[PDB]
């Protein structure tokens, strides 16, 4: 299928090139260099075709990934293959850097020859049997990303959470695991949708499997309803003639008072013609940065069911006042030690029928780490 496969750096030169078919020529890589890196027409599509020649491009670190073919293949498979190539590169030599790429010629050549022939991608499959641990221990990490579009009128415009499971098991033998959570859909939550690892067996739906060795992701899931909102933002904008704006932003901690927030980031929008801003903060530190048109107020810790606010004076430069300032939404970035979804783990039944040790020998470790995704409050 795939013939030539070429990679660039930010400087634009060819780094490593191999072609599996007679169809691809140097003209392809040259046109890719000229028409992507050297072409100033930025607006494009992630794929392109010139003179019946398909070009595939993606940028990571400062490295271009170029794939070229003649036929009507499926894009997704090739893209997955490219992601796999990049990921195995990162695994083999950590950070992806130009010299780091360079010092691996034999690795590159042997991998491309093995993993890929003539454009065809070549490559219990998750855990062996000889794994032993006298200290049967497992760790649970609950990672959830909160997404909110918040209206100036006090209604949630959109809300949805992307959640993934991260677990670190160290157990002897071939443990048989049954995951128990409030899947009643009294504690109960509803799973909007979910995708799993290969080890998960379909047969409330519970998860029965033998976990892979070490750290792995059991399942991928999405939640959209009944999401606990971490924060509430109260916008207030006042215009003062043609020289000043009076904007005071209030934020509500929508979680338990016993919970302390960490690394609170609030980005307050200001116009480009802002002549200056005076910062007032009772908690943390507040800064004004005229460059990117933002007011930086950071709160180290601030408890739930509580409130914090910033008093700001936004001094405007007189300008073409007829075209009014279109207010961007108020964005906040934060990390919470709880899951906004509300998931509750009933149990994790892990049993080893083969070896003569009980479930009490397992040290099961659980923690919640919530992250902010897109959290914007329109004003």
């Amino acid at each position: 299928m795939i013939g030539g496969l070429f990679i660039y750096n930010h400087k634009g030169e060819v780094l490593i090139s191999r072609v599996y078919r007679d169809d691809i020529g140097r003209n392809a890589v040259d046109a890719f260099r000229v028409n992507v890196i050297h072409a100033r027409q930025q607006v494009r599509s992630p794929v392109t075709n010139i003179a019946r020649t398909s070009f595939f491009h993606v940028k990571r670190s400062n490295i271009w990934l170029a794939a070229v073919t003649k036929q009507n293949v499926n894009a997704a498979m090739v893209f997955e293959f490219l992601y796999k190539m990049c990921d195995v590169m990162a695994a083999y030599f950590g950070k992806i850097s130009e010299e780091n790429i360079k010092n691996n010629f034999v690795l590159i050549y042997e991998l491309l020859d093995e993993i890929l022939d003539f454009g065809y991608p070549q490559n219990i499959g998750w855990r062996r049997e000889g794994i032993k641990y006298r200290r049967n221990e497992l760790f649970l990490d609950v990672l959830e990303s909160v997404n909110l579009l918040m209206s100036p009128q006090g209604q949630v415009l959109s809300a949805h959470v992307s959640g993934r499971v991260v677990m670190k098991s160290y157990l002897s033998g071939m443990p048989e695991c049954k995951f128990g959570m409030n899947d009643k859909i009294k504690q109960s939550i509803a799973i909007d949708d979910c995708t799993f690892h290969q080890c998960v067996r379909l047969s409330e739906r519970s998860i029965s499997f033998i976990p892979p060795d070490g750290e792995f992701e059991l399942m991928r899931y999405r939640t959209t309803k009944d999401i606990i909102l971490p924060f509430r933002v109260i916008p207030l904008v006042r215009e003062v003639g043609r020289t000043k704006l009076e904007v005071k932003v209030v934020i509500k901690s929508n979680f338990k008072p016993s919970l302390l927030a960490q690394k609170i980031e609030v980005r307050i929008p200001t116009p480009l013609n802002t002549s200056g801003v005076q910062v007032i903060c009772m908690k943390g530190k507040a800064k004004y940065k005229a460059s990117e048109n933002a007011i930086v107020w950071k709160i180290k810790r601030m408890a739930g069911m509580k409130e914090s606010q910033i008093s700001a004076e936004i001094e405007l430069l007189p300008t073409n006042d007829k075209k009014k300032w279109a207010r961007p939404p108020i964005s906040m970035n934060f990390e919470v030690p709880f899951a906004p979804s509300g998931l509750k783990v009933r149990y994790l039944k892990v049993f080893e029928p083969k070896l003569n040790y009980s479930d009490h020998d397992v040290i099961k470790w659980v923690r919640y780490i919530g992250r902010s995704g897109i959290y914007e409050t329109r004003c």
Partner: peptide
């Protein structure tokens, strides 16, 4: 942080 399950 991690809590005993």
């Amino acid at each position: 942080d991690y809590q005993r399950l």
